[PDB]
């Protein structure tokens, strides 16, 4: 299947990404608390529902929320300010809260059932969010021996997510809170996000020498994100 691309709402970030985030890929955004990772997730969960000529994929959303940070009111705001019906946009976002990392892993299997259910509808799943990908793994796998064990479990979880992305033509979007680099990562594309002044945010592609080497700049607004 040919890949698809979901606009982020920022022309600058879209150019950095070659048009938007890709299906059949895992895009990881990482950065400090408050950098805007979850704002980008909320924005994508609306943008994906737009028709293709407007930068969406007419798609539904699966959202695995590990920090109780999904906000339907934020979806509503973004949708209304983009000309969309907030209640209809919310209808096509299917959210589960992950209690711990083992539940988070099982939820990926449950996600496949929802993906299959919607595959032949007019709004197949096109976006799968895991926010936060790493928070439960960080709290549970800690101390001597944990680096190897945590990395193995996280790699297996990411492999399961890669399979859904690739088998069902879905863009997987995951968030990871960092601080202040030595660990392996298996996402397709890694985007470092940081906060500038007020509502301004700066994005850079990490370890992607074949792709744009500049930086995108965008603002958090009532439309989600915009230039």
């Amino acid at each position: 299947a040919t890949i698809g691309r979901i606009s982020t709402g920022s022309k600058s970030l879209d150019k950095l990404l070659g048009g938007g985030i890709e299906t059949q890929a895992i895009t990881e955004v990482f950065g400090e608390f408050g950098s805007g990772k979850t704002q980008l997730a909320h924005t994508l969960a609306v943008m994906v529902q737009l028709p293709p000529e407007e930068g969406g994929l007419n798609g539904s959303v699966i959202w695995i929320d590990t920090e109780n940070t999904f906000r339907p009111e934020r979806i509503r705001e973004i949708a209304q300010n983009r000309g969309l019906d907030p209640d209809e946009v919310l209808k096509h976002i299917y959210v589960a809260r992950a209690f711990n990392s083992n539940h988070q892993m099982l939820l990926v299997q449950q996600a496949e059932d929802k993906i299959k259910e919607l595959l032949n509808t007019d709004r197949p799943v096109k976006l799968l969010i895991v926010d936060s990908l790493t928070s439960h793994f960080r709290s549970e796998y800690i101390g001597r021996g944990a680096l190897a064990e945590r990395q193995q479990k996280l790699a297996k979880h990411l492999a399961d997510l890669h399979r859904l992305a690739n088998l069902y033509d879905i863009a997987v979007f995951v968030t990871n809170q960092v601080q202040a680099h030595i660990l392996a990562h298996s996402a397709t594309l890694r985007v470092y996000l940081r906060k500038g002044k007020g509502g301004k945010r700066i994005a850079r592609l990490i370890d992607a020498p074949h792709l744009p080497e500049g930086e995108a700049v965008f603002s958090i607004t009532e439309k989600g994100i915009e230039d």
Binding site: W63, P72, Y94
Partner: peptide, 4 residues
């Protein structure tokens, strides 16, 4: 999962 549950619809929002």
């Amino acid at each position: 999962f549950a619809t929002a």
